[PDB]
Amino acid sequence: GKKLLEAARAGQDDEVRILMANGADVNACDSNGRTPLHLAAVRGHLEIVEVLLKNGADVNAWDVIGKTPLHLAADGGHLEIVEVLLKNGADVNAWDLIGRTPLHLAALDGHLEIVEVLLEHGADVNAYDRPGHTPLHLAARRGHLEIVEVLLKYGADVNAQDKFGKTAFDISIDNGNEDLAEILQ
Amino acid sequence: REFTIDFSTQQSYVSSLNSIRTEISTPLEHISQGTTSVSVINHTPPGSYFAVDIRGLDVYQARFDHLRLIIEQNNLYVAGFVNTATNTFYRFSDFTHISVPGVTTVSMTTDSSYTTLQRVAALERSGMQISRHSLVSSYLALMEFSGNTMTRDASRAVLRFVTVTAEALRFRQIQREFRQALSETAPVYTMTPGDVDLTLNWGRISNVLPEYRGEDGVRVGRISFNNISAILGTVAVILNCHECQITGDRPVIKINNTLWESNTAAAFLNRKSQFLYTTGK
Amino acid sequence: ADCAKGKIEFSKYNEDDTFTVKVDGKEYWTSRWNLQPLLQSAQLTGMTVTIKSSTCESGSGFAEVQFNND
Amino acid sequence: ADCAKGKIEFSKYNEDDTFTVKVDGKEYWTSRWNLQPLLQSAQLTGMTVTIKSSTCESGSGFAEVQFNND
Amino acid sequence: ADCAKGKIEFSKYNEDDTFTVKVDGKEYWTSRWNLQPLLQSAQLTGMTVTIKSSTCESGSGFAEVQFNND
Amino acid sequence: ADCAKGKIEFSKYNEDDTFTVKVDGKEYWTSRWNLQPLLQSAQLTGMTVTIKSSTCESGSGFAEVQFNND
Amino acid sequence: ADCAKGKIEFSKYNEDDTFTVKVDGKEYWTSRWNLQPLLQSAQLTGMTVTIKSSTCESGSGFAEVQFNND
Ligand code: NA
Ligand code: NA
Ligand code: NA
Ligand code: NA
Ligand code: NA
Numbered sequence: 001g002k003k004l005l006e007a008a009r010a011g012q013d014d015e016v017r018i019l020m021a022n023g024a025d026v027n028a029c030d031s032n033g034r035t036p037l038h039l040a041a042v043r044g045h046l047e048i049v050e051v052l053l054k055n056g057a058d059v060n061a062w063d064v065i066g067k068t069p070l071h072l073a074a075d076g077g078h079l080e081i082v083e084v085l086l087k088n089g090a091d092v093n094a095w096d097l098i099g100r101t102p103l104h105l106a107a108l109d110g111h112l113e114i115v116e117v118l119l120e121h122g123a124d125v126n127a128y129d130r131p132g133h134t135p136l137h138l139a140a141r142r143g144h145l146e147i148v149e150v151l152l153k154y155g156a157d158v159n160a161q162d163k164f165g166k167t168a169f170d171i172s173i174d175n176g177n178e179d180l181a182e183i184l185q
Numbered sequence: 186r187e188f189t190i191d192f193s194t195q196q197s198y199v200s201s202l203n204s205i206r207t208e209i210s211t212p213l214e215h216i217s218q219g220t221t222s223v224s225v226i227n228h229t230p231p232g233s234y235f236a237v238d239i240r241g242l243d244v245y246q247a248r249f250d251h252l253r254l255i256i257e258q259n260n261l262y263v264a265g266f267v268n269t270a271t272n273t274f275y276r277f278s279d280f281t282h283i284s285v286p287g288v289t290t291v292s293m294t295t296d297s298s299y300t301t302l303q304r305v306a307a308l309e310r311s312g313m314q315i316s317r318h319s320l321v322s323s324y325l326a327l328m329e330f331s332g333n334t335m336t337r338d339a340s341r342a343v344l345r346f347v348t349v350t351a352e353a354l355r356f357r358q359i360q361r362e363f364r365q366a367l368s369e370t371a372p373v374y375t376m377t378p379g380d381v382d383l384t385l386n387w388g389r390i391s392n393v394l395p396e397y398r399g400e401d402g403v404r405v406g407r408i409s410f411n412n413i414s415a416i417l418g419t420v421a422v423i424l425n426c427h428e429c430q431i432t433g434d435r436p437v438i439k440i441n442n443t444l445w446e447s448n449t450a451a452a453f454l455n456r457k458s459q460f461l462y463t464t465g466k
Numbered sequence: 467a468d469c470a471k472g473k474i475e476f477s478k479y480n481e482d483d484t485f486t487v488k489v490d491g492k493e494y495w496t497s498r499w500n501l502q503p504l505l506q507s508a509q510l511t512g513m514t515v516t517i518k519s520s521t522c523e524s525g526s527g528f529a530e531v532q533f534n535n536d
Numbered sequence: 537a538d539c540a541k542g543k544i545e546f547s548k549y550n551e552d553d554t555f556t557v558k559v560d561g562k563e564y565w566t567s568r569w570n571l572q573p574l575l576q577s578a579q580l581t582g583m584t585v586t587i588k589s590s591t592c593e594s595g596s597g598f599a600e601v602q603f604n605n606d
Numbered sequence: 607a608d609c610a611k612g613k614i615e616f617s618k619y620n621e622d623d624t625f626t627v628k629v630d631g632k633e634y635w636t637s638r639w640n641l642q643p644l645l646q647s648a649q650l651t652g653m654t655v656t657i658k659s660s661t662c663e664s665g666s667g668f669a670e671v672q673f674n675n676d
Numbered sequence: 677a678d679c680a681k682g683k684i685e686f687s688k689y690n691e692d693d694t695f696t697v698k699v700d701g702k703e704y705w706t707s708r709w710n711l712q713p714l715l716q717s718a719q720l721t722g723m724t725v726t727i728k729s730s731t732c733e734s735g736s737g738f739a740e741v742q743f744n745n746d
Numbered sequence: 747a748d749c750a751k752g753k754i755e756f757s758k759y760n761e762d763d764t765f766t767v768k769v770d771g772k773e774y775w776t777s778r779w780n781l782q783p784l785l786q787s788a789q790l791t792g793m794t795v796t797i798k799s800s801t802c803e804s805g806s807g808f809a810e811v812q813f814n815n816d
Contacts, residue, residue, distance in 0.1 A: 005467035009522025030467055032530055032621030034520010039467050042519065042526015043492065063520050064621050067527060075495060076525025105527075108482025109495065142481015143599050145590035174567045175481065176554065176597010179590040300794075300816065378683065382722070385816050389792070406791055407683060407722025407815065409746065431753075431792035432675040433651035434613070435535075438511050441582045441606045447511075447651045452787035453577055453717035454507035455647030457640060458499035459569040463709040465779050478602040479571050499570060500642050501619055506574050506603060507643070510581050511650050532618040533646060548728075548742040549711055573713055576743060580721050640779070641759055644786050651790060672758040673786060688812035689781060691798075709780050716784050716813060720791050 001028025008036035008052070011045035016052070026057040033063040041069035041085065044078035049085070059090045066096035074102035074118065077111040082118070092121050099130040107135035107151065110144040119154050126156060131163040140168040140184060143177035148184065158184060186235040187253075190350055192320065193241030195364040202354055202421075209235065209258055210422050215397055216413060221357075223394050223420045225427075226259060232282045233258045236267070237350055242321045249324045254350055255285055260424060261351045262297055263343065268328055275330065275339075295335035299344070299384075306340035310384075313376045315345045316366045348376060348384075356383050357421040382407050383419065388428030390420060392436050393446045395427070402443040469494060469522030474509035484527075489517055492524040501531065508533050539564065539592035544579035554597075559587050562594035571601065578603050609634065609662030611674070614649035624667075629657050632664035641671060648673050679704060679732035684719035687712075694737070699727050704738045711741065718743050749774065749802030754789035764807070769797050772804035781811065788813050 004024040007015040016036075020026065029035055037057045040048040049069075053059065062068055070090040073081045082102075086092065095101055103123040106115045115135075119125065126134050136156040139147040148168075152158065161167055172180040188205045191197040203220075209229075212222035234257050242249040253267040255274060264283040265276035274288040277297035284290070295301060303309055323342030330339040353360040359380055366374040383390075389405045394416070397403060403410040410416040426436075435447040456462065472490035479485055485502045486495040487509070494517050496505075508515050513535055519528040542560035549555055555572045556565040557579070564587045566575075578585050588600040610630035618626040625642045626635040627649070634657045636645075648655050654676035659668040682700035689695050694705040695712050697719070704727050706715075718725050728740035750770035758766040765782045766775040767789070774797045776785075788795050794816045799808035 002467060005520070005522070009467045009469050009519075011523075030518065030520055032518075032520060034467065034518075034522075036467075036521070038521025039469065039519065039523060039526070040521060041523055042469075042494070042521040042528075043523020044525060045523055065529065067520075069521060072521045072523070072526045075527045076523055078523065078525060081523070108484060109480060138482050141483070141599065143588075143590050143597075144481060175599040176565050176567055177481075177590060177599065178593070178596045378685070382683075382815065404721070406720060409722065430675075432673075432790060433648070433653040435650070435652040438650070440510050440512075443582065445581075448790045448792075449721060450511060450581070451647035451651040451653075452720050452790040453573075453580060453713075454503065454510065454650065455643045455786055455790070456503055456573045456713045456717075456783050457643045458502060459572045459574075459710055459713070461499060461639065462713065462780070462783075463569060466709065476602055476604045479568065479574060479600065481599045483568065483570065483599075498619065498623065500623075500639060502570055502574060503577075503643055504619055504646055506577060507646055507650065509603065509605065510577065510583070513650070529623075530619065530621045532616055533649065534616045535650060535652075546742055546744045549708070549714060549740065551739040553708065553710060553739070569710055572710055573717070576714055576717055579743065579745065580717070580723070638759060638763065640763075640782050643783065644759065647786065647790065653790075669763075670759060670761045672756055673789065674756050675789070686812055686814045688796075689778065689784070689810060691810045695780075712780050713783055716787055719813065719815070720787055720793070 001025060001030070004028055005030055005034065005036045005039050008045070008048055009039040009043055011043055011048055013047050013051060016048055020055055026052060026055045027061065035061045037061060037069045038063065038072050041078065041081055042072040042076050044076055044081050046080050046084065049081055053088050059085060059088050060094065068094045070094065071096065071102050071105055074106045074111070074114055075109060077109065077114060079113045079117060082114050086121050092118060092123050093127065099128065101127045103127060103135050104129060104138055107139040107144070107147050108142060110142065110147055112146045112150055115147055115150055125151070125154055126160065133162055134160050136160065136168045137162060137171055140172040140177070140180050141175055143175060143180055145180055145183055148180055187238060188235060189238045189240050191241040192239070192317065192367055193244045195367050197241055198364050198367055199360060202360055205354055206422055213395060215399065216394060216416055218417060221417055223416060224422050225395065226261070226422060226425045228425055229258045231259060232284070234264060234283050239324065239346070242317065242324055249321060252324050252327055254346060255283060256351060257283060260428070261354055261422070263347045263351050264297065266327055266343065270328065291333055293333050293335060302340045302344050305335050306337055306344055308341050308344060310344060310348070310376050311378050311381045313344060314373045315349060315363060315376070316373045317371050319345055320349065352384050355387055355422050356419060357417065358383060358419040360421065361418070388424055389431065389446055391423035392426045392429040393444065394420065394423055396437045397444055400439060400442050400444040404443055404449060405446040406449050467518065467522050469517040469519050469528060471514060471516040473512055474505060474515060477505055477509050489515060494526055494528045496528050498529050504533065505531070537588065537590065537592055539587040539589050539598065541584060541586040543582050543584060544575060547575050547579050559585055564589065564596060564598045566598050568599050574603070607658065607662055609657045609659050609666065609668070611654060611656040613652050613654055614645060617646055617649050627657070629655060632662065634659065634666050634668045636668050638669055644673070645671070677729065677732050679727045679729050679738065681724060681726040683722050683724060684715060687716055687719050699725060702734050704736060706738050708739050714743065715741070722746070747799065747802055749797045749799050749806065749808070751794060751796040753792050753794055754785060757786055757789050767795070769795060772802070774799065774806055774808045776808050778809050784813065785811070
């Protein structure tokens with residue numbers, strides 16, 4: 001399994017095709033459950049994702065954490081690979097063990113293009129993490145002003161309170177992101 | 186071997202130290218300029234010692250000339266002192282392996298450590314003053330000393346003498362600072378916290394400097410050297426690390442062109458996530 | 467899979483409290499907080515790190531990494 | 537934005553448990569406790585850090601910082 | 607029992623948040639969070655550790671380890 | 677106010693959960709655990725710390741301290 | 747009482763999560779979580795630590811320790 005997941009991570013499309021043609025399993029997990037689709041998705045290798053998916057690799061397949069290829073794509077900012085996963089039936093609102101949606105992850109890492117594509121595919125804008133953290137809280141935290149402005153524009157709840165009562169405005173002040181605080185006024 | 190450390194003038198004093206260094210150590214290839222280097226003590230069997238006759242406390246006079254320090258050569262510790270008038274070697278309890286032929290050996294109950302000496306002396310090295318006058322007083326205390334147990338004044342004398350002999354031999358910094366007290370103005374040398382720290386880090390410094398290959402700096406615990414002149418201006422002689430090792434087996438790690446004692450970096454890189462640390466009470 | 471193996475080229479604490487490292491030319495991030503000091507220590511001391519993960523595309527998450535002094 | 541890039545000139549733990557660093561002549565503070573020892577290790581070792589924030593005015597906050605070696 | 611005594615040959619942060627070290631040719635994992643940086647620092651300095659566990663085969667877990675000055 | 681400036685002479689964790697450092701001949705304590713590793717690291721690396729407080733009385737608590745390499 | 751003052755001869759993370767150091771030939775354990783990295787840093791750098799406790803027999807616990815620079 002290791003060779004097909006190494007090839008996938010390296011984006012080596014002809015090595016993926018040769019291993020597949022020698023009967024390597026398309027769904028082959030590492031330790032921690034990472035499948036070749038997970039590795040391809042995190043590296044943004046579009047061509048590898050399309051050849052894996054057209055060999056019958058499981059689009060929703062979950063790590064031990066409950067991270068799916070659409071989560072790994074989102075974490076990595078890989079817009080085109082997010083779009084092809086969604087167009088092959090990957091669940092937009094898949095939540096990991098700790099309730100994190102792909103919209104939470106995108107928000108967390110500042111990736112405005114995939115925040116916009118996820119929202120347009122029906123991502124739950126106000127989705128609550130286990131400690132009641134919304135995407136707006138993760139994006140006010142980490143100081144991603146552009147994300148915070150794309151949220152708010154799409155009807156994100158500014159009033160929403162985490163498990164400690166703390167708003168998005170609170171968590172910007174506690175991160176000393178004064179421009180985020182201004183934008184949240 | 187016997188050497189003299191002559192306190193008559195700064196010249197005689199530095200000359201004396203340099204002569205000792207040249208005989209008992211060899212310069213590091215990479216930390217040597219002219220004949221001023223960081224040198225590694227040449228290997229000698231444990232128990233090997235050299236005697237240091239203290240001279241010149243009264244400038245250029247053959248007075249106050251009955252004190253000899255016995256220095257274990259491999260580590261430069263002062264194993265004890267000899268009253269040459271009474272032919273008596275007062276040896277610290279941790280140096281029973283040092284035998285001086287021809288003298289009466291008085292094995293003391295007191296060990297040689299600074300922890301002990303400072304306690305018995307009721308004198309901390311940090312801030313300790315040494316002047317020509319206090320070395321004479323120190324000499325007189327040692328010559329008056331008799332007994333198998335150090336007294337406060339004898340301990341104070343040894344603290345002062347170890348500093349200006351063994352520690353100055355190790356550290357050109359101490360040689361430089363202390364030697365001012367030998368000038369005609371007779372100022373007072375005050376041992377600084379930095380001087381104390383050097384003495385406390387000698388083994389660590391010794392383990393690291395041999396690895397130096399011109400890095401932009403050297404960091405050993407609290408000690409920092411930013412260039413070779415800082416190294417040379419500070420350290421003269423190091424242990425032969427071939428108390429060099431505290432734990433582990435990796436002398437150094439080069440980080441951002443600075444040679445770090447690996448233990449030091451390990452000691453601030455062994456923290457877990459701060460949030461978890463503080464909340465996990 | 468072994469996503470990347472090499473020295474950490476840079477690391478970065480992110481606003482979402484995850485931590486990114488660039489290894490062998492690829493960036494990966496982890497949300498595991500205890501990996502922050504572990505990775506920064508590896509970076510400072512020049513350890514070779516092997517980022518391991520189900521998927522290995524640049525910008526992907528990881529929570530398994532091996533550390534070698536060499 | 538990249539607010540400041542350079543070595544940490546001083547760091548400072550504040551009474552409100554935030555932590556300030558001065559980089560390239562500008563001071564920035566962070567309320568992310570995790571960054572405290574990471575910034576101190578970077579300061580100790582002369583890492584070049586890049587303070588990143590949407591607001592770069594000296595005295596403002598940050599929660600994103602890149603750590604580079606020489 | 608004292609399963610392995612020697613330097614850490616490699617360490618590894620695992621997906622399940624446990625941490626593995628290879629000592630005397632055998633891998634051992636621990637779920638003690640506090641041991642992660644302590645083992646990594648031991649590793650970086652070549653500190654000898656003694657892994658103590660009920661079973662000593664490679665793959666065994668441990669919750670006790672001695673950091674030696676050997 | 678700058679209460680003391682200098683290297684840390686000793687540090688001490690007390691049974692009452694306070695952490696004392698002696699700087700420039702004066703002792704101050706803090707119960708911020710965040711400061712323990714920071715202060716001890718400053719101590720073992722010889723950083724110059726500046727203890728700051730509105731309260732500069734000996735034996736008083738502090739929670740503001742600047743760290744400088746020197 | 748000052749039970750022991752000396753360098754840490756070994757440290758050990760115990761199965762009950764307490765942490766033991768051997769100082770002056772006697773073993774002392776502490777359940778104070780904050781002390782683990784500090785004690786290991788002292789061990790790594792050869793700091794003289796002073797174990798203070800109400801009982802000094804080997805096997806006693808402690809919650810107070812001084813970290814000196816000798
Ligand atoms: Na000479
Ligand atoms: Na010589
Ligand atoms: Na070492
Ligand atoms: Na991944
Ligand atoms: Na800012």
